[PDB]
Amino acid sequence: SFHRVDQKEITQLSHLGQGTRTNVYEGRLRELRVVLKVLDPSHHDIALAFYETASLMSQVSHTHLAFVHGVCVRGPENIMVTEYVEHGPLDVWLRRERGHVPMAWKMVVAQQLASALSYLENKNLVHGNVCGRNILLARLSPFIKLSDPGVGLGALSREERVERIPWLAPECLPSTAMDKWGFGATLLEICFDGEAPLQSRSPSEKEHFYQRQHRLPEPPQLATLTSQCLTYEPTQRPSFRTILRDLT
Amino acid sequence: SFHRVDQKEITQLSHLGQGTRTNVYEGRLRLRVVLKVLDPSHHDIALAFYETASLMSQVSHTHLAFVHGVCVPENIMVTEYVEHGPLDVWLRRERGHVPMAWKMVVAQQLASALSYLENKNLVHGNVCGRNILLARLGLAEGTSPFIKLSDPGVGLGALSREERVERIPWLAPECLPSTAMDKWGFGATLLEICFDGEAPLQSRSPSEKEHFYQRQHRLPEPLATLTSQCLTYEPTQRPSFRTILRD
Ligand SMILES: CNC(=O)c1cnc(Nc2ccc(F)cn2)cc1Nc1ccccc1S(C)(=O)=O
Numbered sequence: 001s002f003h004r005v006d007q008k009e010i011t012q013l014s015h016l017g018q019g020t021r022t023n024v025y026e027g028r029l030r031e032l033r034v035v036l037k038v039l040d041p042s043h044h045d046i047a048l049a050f051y052e053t054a055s056l057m058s059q060v061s062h063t064h065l066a067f068v069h070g071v072c073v074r075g076p077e078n079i080m081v082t083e084y085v086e087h088g089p090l091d092v093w094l095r096r097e098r099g100h101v102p103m104a105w106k107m108v109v110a111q112q113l114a115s116a117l118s119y120l121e122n123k124n125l126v127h128g129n130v131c132g133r134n135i136l137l138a139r140l141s142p143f144i145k146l147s148d149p150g151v152g153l154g155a156l157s158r159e160e161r162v163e164r165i166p167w168l169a170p171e172c173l174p175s176t177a178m179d180k181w182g183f184g185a186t187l188l189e190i191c192f193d194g195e196a197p198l199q200s201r202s203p204s205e206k207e208h209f210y211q212r213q214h215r216l217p218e219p220p221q222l223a224t225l226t227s228q229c230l231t232y233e234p235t236q237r238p239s240f241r242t243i244l245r246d247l248t
Numbered sequence: 249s250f251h252r253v254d255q256k257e258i259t260q261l262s263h264l265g266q267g268t269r270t271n272v273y274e275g276r277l278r279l280r281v282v283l284k285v286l287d288p289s290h291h292d293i294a295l296a297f298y299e300t301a302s303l304m305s306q307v308s309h310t311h312l313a314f315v316h317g318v319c320v321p322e323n324i325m326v327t328e329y330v331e332h333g334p335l336d337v338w339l340r341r342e343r344g345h346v347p348m349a350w351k352m353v354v355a356q357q358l359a360s361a362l363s364y365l366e367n368k369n370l371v372h373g374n375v376c377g378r379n380i381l382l383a384r385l386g387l388a389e390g391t392s393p394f395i396k397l398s399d400p401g402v403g404l405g406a407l408s409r410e411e412r413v414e415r416i417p418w419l420a421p422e423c424l425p426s427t428a429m430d431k432w433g434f435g436a437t438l439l440e441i442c443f444d445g446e447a448p449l450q451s452r453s454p455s456e457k458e459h460f461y462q463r464q465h466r467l468p469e470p471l472a473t474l475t476s477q478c479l480t481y482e483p484t485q486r487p488s489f490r491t492i493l494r495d
């Protein structure tokens with residue numbers, strides 16, 4: 001249950017970047033500025049995991065969640081028509097403004113992210129792709145929108161799950177609990193100005209880090225919170241009601 | 249008058265474009281900045297470039313771009329880098345898809361900056377879409393654009409007749425052979441904005457542009473009352489920016 005968009009209602013503009021099995025563009029929707037996520041020519045299992053994301057995002061409403069307008073089918077291409085956010089991905093912005101991002105600013109983003117994830121938790125819904133790249137800035141206090149997760153995690157290959165380390169929950173390498181790990185790793189990425197740990201490490205090194213059960217570094221007002229979220233035991237991770245209450 | 253910047257504090261990068269007697273580059277200041285590199289010039293030209301740095305260093309307004317100072321045979325104005333660049337370039341890229349409400353925001357922000365200059369009895373002398381820079385695009389829902397009026401570059405008084413003729417239709421007709429000239433500049437800029445970065449007479453030759461002003465021909469209608477009032481050949485008949493801003 002998502003809206004079907006005819007290709008006559010959309011205009012594809014400049015390439016913005018790439019997602020997992022997708023090419024992201026700016027566009028218009030008849031007029032609104034939108035973001036088009038063009039899925040690669042794919043088999044039905046991949047397309048279905050992309051429809052599941054459109055469905056999930058069409059059934060939710062939260063101020064810190066980006067809007068999904070619907071889905072367009074253009075030949076072998078599936079297009080998710082989504083909300084355009086002014087300043088784009090958070091990680092890109094953090095690397096541009098490195099050393100000049102206040103801790104109070106980072107705490108606002110963390111609270112807004114926990115708020116969106118608490119809402120998904122209450123509805124027993126899984127995002128499965130929480131990372132700085134999927135955090136979009138509507139305003140630079142800041143105002144964030146968590147993007148759709150793209151092709152659902154369950155449809156991806158081991159190689160793609162290994163690429164998602166350290167954001168990927170370790171139990172997903174071979175539940176709502178995976179988003180606490182995602183949130184925790186995202187907090188480290190925010191503290192480190194868009195420089196996530198293990199980003200210079202090879203796939204074998206990333207996989208060995210998880211296989212040996214090595215823990216990620218400490219970020220100071222967030223060290224306890226991240227350490228609790230970044231536990232290999234999913235049941236031991238705190239709830240977002242706890243995380244959100246503790247951020248206040 | 250303005251801050252002096254040593255060549256050791258600035259790094260020159262990508263070539264953005266050209267200005268009147270300048271080459272505009274992206275740069276770094278030990279901050280991302282814009283470097284306005286003056287061509288090898290006579291002292292009258294350099295002095296008119298210093299007058300601009302001096303004028304822009306003595307002003308502070310949210311819709312006016314910042315001047316960091318000057319680096320001194322090379323005269324380099326070190327200025328504020330504005331994210332999306334020139335308005336006219338953007339308008340031509342987005343032709344047919346720019347809402348009227350968006351254009352009205354830009355017009356208000358421009359009149360606001362020019363009202364501030366008017367109150368201080370300061371003359372810009374180069375109001376055009378090219379000198380309007382977009383800090384924000386106002387593309388997302390419930391977001392409006394945010395403009396910064398650039399410095400005027402080499403002051404009008406130092407330029408040749410050929411360069412003043414090239415500035416038509418933005419150039420006030422009394423300048424071809426006062427704060428009043430910025431009302432004409434503003435009016436012509438409003439036409440350019442309404443026409444999606446396509447100013448009138450832009451395809452016309454220098455002889456044609458000069459004949460248009462010499463015969464006292466009036467520019468087309470786009471805001472129609474406001475532009476018609478601003479684009480009058482009698483400088484005293486042009487409305488004040490307090491009137492323009494209030495309207
Ligand atoms: C749900 N909508 C989005 O995901 C989305 C919304 N607004 C954007 N604004 C923007 C503004 C300026 C700019 F320079 C770049 N982007 C970017 C977006 N995605 C994006 C864009 C590029 C690369 C990766 C992604 S992603 C999250 O899809 O991986």
Ligand SMILES: CNC(=O)c1cnc(Nc2ccc(F)cn2)cc1Nc1ccccc1S(C)(=O)=O
Nearest residue numbers: 264265272282313327329330331332333379398
């Ligand atoms: C006072 N500061 C400026 O003038 C200035 C500030 N930011 C710019 N950002 C920008 C961003 C993206 C892009 F692709 C191009 N430019 C361009 C600028 N000038 C400029 C640049 C090229 C041509 C003409 C001028 S001009 C006004 O000097 O005539």
